[PDB]
């Protein structure tokens, strides 16, 4: 954040920051908030049908809302720091950010076979998708 | 087919898998494979 | 065999052209092909990633055909009110301009609550934690109870071969002619 | 989405078009995350469109023999100089 401030004050030329806890994902809207894409007059986005349950006509272009963070109350073993993750929503499913409160990185593990650990998925039921996203108040 | 430029050729397979019976059990070949997930589960149950 | 070649000329005659409308559908001349798999992985009620998401069901067995076991909600089990509202929403098309345009999914109505009941289940197991031919290969270890021999034939030139699994059944042969001809030297 | 755009004027073939393509990981790509983000497929330039191999329809190409698959960024090599590619 010091940088950035740097960046912004900057006399003349582009002073550049570089933020290295960051991470990107691969995060389409699901395809089961469309009908009667063919497979096995290829469909296209000017003939995808919607039927998107949460408040857009669209069903292609993502969306997200209230990221907000938290301390886990759950104790973690003596001589660690209190755990700490975030949530935000987007079409389809929460996604979980996590956390190492020991030197406040990202979580990653040795494999590079699984996937940057740092972010998850959970896909919402038919109750959760017909909420309307739009309407997102508060956290 | 008759394409622009009126270059043409016959509409079938270049090479085929070697076999077609109910025991096969090819990875490159989903339209020739005759094993399934279902069938393993039908056939543990049953040969049990 | 002989199914018809797309190649890449030809889909212009036989589906590259054929759109369809709010009111009309096509039936391609094209000569589809593929055995039980293929079948199967098309037309089967297949589980996903997502809840109810398959649009194919056939029919319903005449007996048990599965194992099964399985982890359950203990407190949605006794949270889940006593009577189950169904509506408009699990009804069939009342004519058939409805079932051309046919909704695969919709949201449940105020009144309503058979959305609740879908999630009792955590987890579930159907067999062995095994993958692809490895399955197979369990199947022909498991000893047949009416004489004490595995259907693998091993533990005993001319000797007899294997039900189950593949392996030393014909001859090992390179798969470098086969279809495509392409990354079966390395993936 | 940030792309570039011609915003050329005068026989400028891509004018008034916007330069994207898919960069969606070739099949053959060799699986586990690491090697499906760092697929060189669409790395410099278009790659993806329409492919039918034997008779198994895909989008993305099957692959990514004389040497390596090149891709790169759809402004011909003579108007290279005179091209007018702005963000939107």
Not at chain 1, 33 to 49: N, Q
Not at chain 3, 58 to 77: G, K, Q, R, T
Not at chain 3, 121 to 140: I, K
């Amino acid at each position: 954040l010091r940088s950035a401030k740097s960046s912004a004050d900057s006399t003349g030329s582009d002073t550049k920051v570089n933020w290295s806890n960051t991470q990107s994902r691969y995060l389409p809207v699901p395809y089961n908030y469309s009908e009667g894409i063919i497979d096995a007059s290829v469909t296209t986005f000017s003939g995808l049908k919607s039927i998107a349950p949460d408040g857009f006509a669209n069903s292609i272009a993502n969306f997200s809302v209230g990221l907000k963070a938290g301390i886990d109350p759950n104790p973690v073993m003596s001589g660690k720091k209190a755990n700490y993750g975030a949530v935000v929503l987007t079409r389809g499913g929460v996604v979980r950010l996590n956390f190492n409160p020991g030197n406040d990185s990202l979580l990653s593990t040795t494999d590079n076979n699984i996937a940057p650990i740092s972010f998850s998925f959970t896909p919402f039921t038919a109750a959760e998708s017909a909420v309307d996203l739009t309407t997102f108040k508060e956290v | 087919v008759t394409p622009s430029g009126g270059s043409s050729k016959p509409t079938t397979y270049p090479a085929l898998p070697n076999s077609i019976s109910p025991t096969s059990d090819w990875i490159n070949a989903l339209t020739f494979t005759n094993k399934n997930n279902p069938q393993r589960n039908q056939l543990l149950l049953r040969s049990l | 065999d002989i199914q018809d070649n797309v190649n890449n000329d030809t889909v212009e005659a036989l589906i590259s052209s054929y759109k369809n409308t709010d009111k009309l559908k096509h039936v391609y001349p094209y000569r589809y092909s593929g055995l039980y798999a293929w079948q199967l992985f098309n037309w089967s009620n297949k589980l996903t990633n997502t809840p109810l998401s398959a649009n194919f069901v056939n029919e319903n067995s005449y007996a048990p055909n599965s194992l099964f076991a399985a982890i359950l909600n203990e407190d949605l089990l006794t949270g889940l009110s006593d009577k189950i509202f169904y509506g408009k929403e699990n009804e069939f098309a009342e004519n058939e301009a409805d079932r051309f345009n046919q909704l695969l999914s919709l949201n449940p109505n105020p009144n309503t609550n058979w959305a609740r009941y879908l999630n009792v289940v955590q987890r579930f197991t159907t067999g062995p934690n095994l993958d692809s031919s490895t399955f197979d290969q369990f199947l022909d270890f498991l000893p047949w109870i009416g004489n004490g021999k595995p259907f693998s034939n091993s533990p005993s030139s001319s000797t007899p071969l294997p039900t189950f699994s593949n392996i030393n059944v014909g001859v090992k042969s390179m798969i470098t002619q086969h279809l495509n001809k392409e990354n079966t030297r390395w993936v | 989405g940030s792309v570039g755009y011609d915003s050329s004027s005068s026989s400028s073939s891509t004018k008034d078009q916007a330069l994207a393509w898919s960069t969606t990981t070739s099949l053959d790509s060799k699986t586990g995350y690491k090697d499906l983000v760092t697929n060189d497929t669409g790395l410099n330039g278009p790659i993806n469109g329409s492919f039918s191999i034997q008779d198994t329809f895909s989008f993305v190409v099957p692959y990514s023999t004389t040497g390596p698959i090149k891709t790169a960024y759809p402004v011909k090599k003579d108007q290279k100089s005179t091209v007018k590619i702005n963000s939107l």
